[PDB]
Amino acid sequence: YLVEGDSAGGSAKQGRDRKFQAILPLRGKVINTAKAKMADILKNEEINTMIYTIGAGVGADFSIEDANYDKIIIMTDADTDGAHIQTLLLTFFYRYMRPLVEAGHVYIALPPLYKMSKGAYAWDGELEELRLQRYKGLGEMNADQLWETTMNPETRTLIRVTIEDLARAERRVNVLMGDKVEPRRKWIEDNVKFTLENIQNMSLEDIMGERFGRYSKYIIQDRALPDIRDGLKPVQRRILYSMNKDSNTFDKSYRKSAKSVGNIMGNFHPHGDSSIYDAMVRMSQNWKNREILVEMHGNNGSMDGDPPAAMRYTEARLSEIAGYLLQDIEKKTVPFAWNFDDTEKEPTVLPAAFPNLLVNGSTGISAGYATDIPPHNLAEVIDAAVYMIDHPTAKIDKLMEFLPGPDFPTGAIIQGRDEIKKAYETGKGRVVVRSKTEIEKLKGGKEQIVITEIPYEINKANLVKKIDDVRVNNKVAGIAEVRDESDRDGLRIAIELKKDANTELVLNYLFKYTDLQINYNFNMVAIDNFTPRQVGIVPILSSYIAHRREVILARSRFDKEKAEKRLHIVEGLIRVISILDEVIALIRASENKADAKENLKVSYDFTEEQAEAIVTLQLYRLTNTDVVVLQEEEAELREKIAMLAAIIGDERTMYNLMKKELREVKKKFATPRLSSLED
Amino acid sequence: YLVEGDSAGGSAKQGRDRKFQAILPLRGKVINTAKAKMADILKNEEINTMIYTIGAGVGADFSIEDANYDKIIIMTDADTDGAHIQTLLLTFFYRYMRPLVEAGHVYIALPPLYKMAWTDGELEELLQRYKGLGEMNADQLWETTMNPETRTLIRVTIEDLARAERRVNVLMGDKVEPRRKWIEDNVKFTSNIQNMSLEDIMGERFGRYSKYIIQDRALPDIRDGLKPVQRRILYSMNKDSNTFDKSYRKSAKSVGNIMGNFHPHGDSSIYDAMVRMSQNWKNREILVEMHGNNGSMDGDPPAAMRYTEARLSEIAGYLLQDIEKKTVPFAWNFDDTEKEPTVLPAAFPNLLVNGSTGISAGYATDIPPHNLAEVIDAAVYMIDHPTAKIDKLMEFLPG
Amino acid sequence: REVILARSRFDKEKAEKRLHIVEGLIRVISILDEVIALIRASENKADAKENLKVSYDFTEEQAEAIVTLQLYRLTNTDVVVLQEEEAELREKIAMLAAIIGDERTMYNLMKKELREVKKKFATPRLSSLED
DNA sequence: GGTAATACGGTTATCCACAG
DNA sequence: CTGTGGATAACCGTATTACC
Ligand SMILES: [Mg+2]
Ligand SMILES: [Mg+2]
């Protein structure tokens, strides 16, 4: 039994029949033995101990008859990453112990993902025909459960891999697991449906099919790529939503991170506290995000790349603009959905009162797709969205009057306008990004280059170091000293030169051969209707706009319905201030809460709503009985209800609402450019 | 600047003036240079890194003139484990680099523990608690502790050599008895550069560590039988209504709660405690029911906290009986955000039933488990026989 | 001991605040028709309570209790029922004060609850003893 | 030379795309 | 061959008492 990690190894070792069943635990994900050379492939711990533990040799030196076991069962967890491993491993026994695979000795264990409580297991159709707990991994199952449901011969089911049409198998392991992304992506497009989908043999091709498809789809939709609307990946949305639900906002205390992480992993995000804290930290670093979404107290990283305080230390809390990412989430504005567990519902997208995806950016490594979208200036983005609200048909050159190019939080200089255009047109382009520098004439007569902004996502330490590395290797002459002078109130790298040293030469060699100047490649993929799309500035801005339409609309309906309800109650309270002594003597007349409501409804034609309201009143209320205040309430109610009705009804009314709010956000948060542009 | 690990090393590194200040991160507790073989003290990685960084040579080969720095500043987190590291480092300097401590070159840094304040006498005269330097932002660190203008630094000196070799060798010595004596004696359980003798620094510091590690960690309370971590676990679990009669709950949530609301320490320690509390070959009457992998008598590691769910057991219910009905002393927590009980109602005698074990400083504890029945027998007998002698009691509590 | 005591002091104090409130409630049913009317023109909640006190010798506990009664509860006017509650409360307050005053009733309870726990949870011996 | 249990620290290898 | 960021999985140094 091949098992991932030692915690699953525990459940296995304890559930197993110890006479004829072994367990080999595996640290992590297994090496892709179709993507790396036989060099690394043979120098790999897991691989090696796997060859050993099976004892029959790899490659052409493999003997089916020297094999220590009859069956080689891959029992990974039931989840996505489980499936991906079933893949990687299946593509190692195909590429290196093929006779094992061909002879029908590699099987795949089918443990369950869920379980019921009445107070019945779950492999979607018998969980309905028999009348929850999602298993993170094996180690969440108790040993007897593992045994009776998956490890026991008399009871278990097993999928039995067999190579049926050899050549086709070869083709498939090649598309899916090989080095060239292209055919893998075509395969996904052609096969994966992003909307919405004892012993028993399946072919290598089919098994590899389902498992990779499952991995691919989940990892595209639900991990790596952002939503084209709110611009967030699942983990970031879940962080914002859970923190906000817990009242941890900008206007209150800070709060110890590891509580937050514990909750986020308790309620929304079934993965390591590692990934969660990591994401939460990144959201707090003003040199990674252009507009930060989380404020953190304490060591939260730095441009040198030093580790943030481990999560036991650092206080955190939502920023202010994040609130604007979640405004009106309470007014039924956005699609919710059950979490992994079914304890709670969670949002699938946020209202997003500002256009995040273009402002903060996204990056970006999925499977078959990968995204890279630079940040922009909140002002400029809003300006374009607002022009496009009045001008659906707008062309790129025009919009670029408002959206000239990216605005990195790390400043610098961006060269390449035709390519910024190319990328806003198509989603893909290449641009150059160059550091800010002054030249500094020092005492004596020696010049000194002072770098003061560096390229986006460049490690400052690494850089300074790779420059001193140019010095001591005399890759060019000039550099007398290289010294990081950065501090509390600035970023300053002083490259001091010798007397007589071509400063222009040194500078150019530096831009050429170090990361003082790099390329940014746009690759703007986002999830737009459940499938990945490569998009220019237009489907992004459009998508945004229509989102805000839907949000505003559902909001206006929620408020209007609320309003109506209230109006319909006051309409009762007034017409019961009239027949008061009668209604009191009637509730006193009645017998028990239901007879009182039924009687309030029979004897004076109140509704359920109005009945419950009146009967559920308090005695101290009866003191104040002024119908003029109620009438003012009723009136205001009516005017509101009307303007709501107007927003829901009239289109241009709603688009102006959109623009007013947007211009309000812009006014509040507008910050000046940091990245200068050059053509 | 000697700092305790890379988390605090961050803030150190940032908030520092780079022209003259250096930062050496140490990875944990420093080795005790009194208790260890010279084989070990030789091989110890951090020891070597310090002996090179200070660049002067150890002990007998120590040349004061070759000191790369005028001041060697000790900056540990403000809490107790802090003071204990201060202690270990200090004895190392006393031992294998004496004339540095003799010249007054070894200074101790003074970070604040809380805010709105040092100590606990001046804070009461007025609220976050810095559980390690890594949740202090760099500006704060500079202003409060690293700025040669603003800061305050304890300035360690050997003021009477004879009266020093004793204290170090007693508080750090291999032999326990003299330490225990010292503790029983001195520990009561209930300014730009200030100078202080080694005797008094090592004194007050080891006093702090010892007192905390005895009172609030390693030894159990003679009434509910719990060490504090176990107590916050049962209390918090029960507050969230994570009880025996209601569907297990991802431990990894419970632990975040415990760390943020009650137990300001590393997840590791907390989850490990909760799990041991679920293992029925360690506990005679388990207090936590846990679901999934939670170890074996072979010791295979429990599933990590991401995996297993848990709830209180039924009988833990009784350990918590009537807690709501103002039946037990509460106190504020590390935050001053919430109240936690200081001892539980204990509707059975847990200290004898599940036992305890058992390592602090000067004291260790080993009390083996017993039968819940038999202990309850003896308890009832004693209730009607205040003066009961051991031999009669053993007719109920054989062993 | 300390626990059983303080627990008992808690249970008593609660039973008593209740008792007090129910006696109040009974009296309110007696003079019931003008309670309403006195509130009905009494400026506000505050002056409603003030007017209940400075006119009917009510207590603030009974006052806030009355004036914030739900309207649908003016259905239930059953006096004998509230009187039965009054009975049970009195018996409880008795027992509890007994525990607090008789340092022998208390210890007997202690024994009671301890043996209760024994029947609920006792399991057999496991490590055998040899000398 | 070993382990006991509650504390203090930190670290590494994998997949995925896409760049020079 | 390196780094990007959201995922998988492990790993081990130190203190403290105590006893062969
Ligand atoms: Mg370059
Ligand atoms: Mg690169």
Residue numbers in the entry:
A (entry chain A): 430 to 548, 556 to 559, 561 to 568, 577 to 642, 1003 to 1484
B (entry chain B): 430 to 545, 558 to 567, 577 to 640, 1002 to 1210
C (entry chain B): 1354 to 1484
Please share text taken word for word from the publication where this structure appeared.
First, to prevent subunit dissociation and generate a stabilized complex, we engineered a catalytically active fusion protein comprising the full-length ParE and breakage-reunion ParC55 domain. Second, we used an alternative gate-DNA, namely, a 34mer DNA duplex comprising the plasmid V-site, which we have shown is also strongly cleaved by pneumococcal topo IV (Arnoldi ref). Co-crystallization of the fusion protein with a 2.2-fold excess of V-site DNA yielded a crystal structure in space group P42212 with the best resolution of 3.7 Å. This new structure reveals a novel (ParE-ParC55)2 dimer complex bound to two DNA molecules and adopting the open clamp conformation (open ParE N-gate; closed G and C gates). The DNA bound at the G-gate is bent and uncleaved and adopts an A-form conformation immediately at the scission sequence while retaining B-form on the flanks for drug-free DNA complexes of ParC55 with ParE30 (19). By contrast, the second DNA molecule links each of four complexes together within the crystal lattice by binding to the long helices of the C-gate via ParC R468, K464, N461 and H196 residues and is entirely in the linear unbent B-form. The presence of a second DNA-binding site on ParC has not been reported previously, and its unveiling is most likely a consequence of the higher ratio of DNA used in the crystallization conditions. The complex was crystallized in the absence of ATP and reveals novel aspects of the open N-gate conformation. The two N-terminal ParE ATPase domains (residues 1–399 shown in red in Figure 3) (that dimerize on ATP binding to close the N-gate) are located far apart fully exposing the G-segment (in green) to the solvent from above. In our structure, the ATP binding site is empty and covered by the neighbouring α-helix from the same ParE monomer, plausibly protecting it from ATP binding before T-segment capture, a feature not previously observed in other crystal structures of the ATPase domains of ParE and GyrB dimers. The link is mobile and poorly ordered, so its exact fold is not evident from the crystallographic data.
Topoisomerase (topo) IV and gyrase are the type II enzymes expressed in bacteria. Topo IV mediates the unlinking of daughter chromosomes before cell division, whereas gyrase is unique in its ability to introduce negative supercoils into DNA thereby controlling chromosome supercoiling, which promotes replication fork advance and allows global regulation of gene expression. In each case, the active complex is a tetramer of two topo IV ParC and ParE subunits or gyrase GyrA and GyrB proteins. By contrast, the N-terminal and C-terminal regions of the highly conserved ParE (GyrB) subunits form the ATPase- and Mg2+-binding-TOPRIM domains, respectively.
